Amino acid sequence: FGTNGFDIPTIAIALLIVGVIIGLSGLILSIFATATASAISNPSPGTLAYNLTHPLINGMVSFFSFFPTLYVLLGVTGIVLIAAGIISIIMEKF
């Protein structure tokens, strides 16, 4: 059901695959992050361990705050792909 490489069943299957993969990734990351939160303690505000450990958790927080826009762009890509497919169909179907 298509012209050259655009196949609606294939597109649906690809959407399925990316959806389940993203769900799994969120699941695994949340489960692991719970263990991370449990493991690390809060020694004190001003002793050696605080100086030793605080920037690491800061980097954790920053990277994980970067994740959302990555996911948003990844979502945007699919609309572009389906659009190029529609345009390609229209170009030489007539």
Region 20-79 residues binding its own copies, contact defined as CB under 8 A: 20-41, 43, 47-49, 51-53, 55-79
Listed in sequence order, the residues at least 6 apart from 13 whose beta carbon sits closer than 8 Å to its beta carbon are none
CA distances from 90 to 7, 10, 34, 79, 86 (A): 14, 19, 50, 17, 6
**37 or 45: whose CB is closer to its own copies?**
37
CB of 4 to its own copies, least distance (A): 12
Select from 54, 27, 51 the least CA-distant residue to 40: 54
CB of 93 to its own copies, least distance (A): 4
19 binds its own copies (CB under 8 A): yes
CB of 45 to its own copies, least distance (A): 14
With CB under 8 A, what is the number of residues at the site for its own copies? 80
Residue type, 2: G
CB of 80 to its own copies, least distance (A): 6
87 binds its own copies (CB under 8 A): yes
> Using N-to-C axis directions, what is the helix angle for 48-93 and 8-39, rounded to 10°?
180
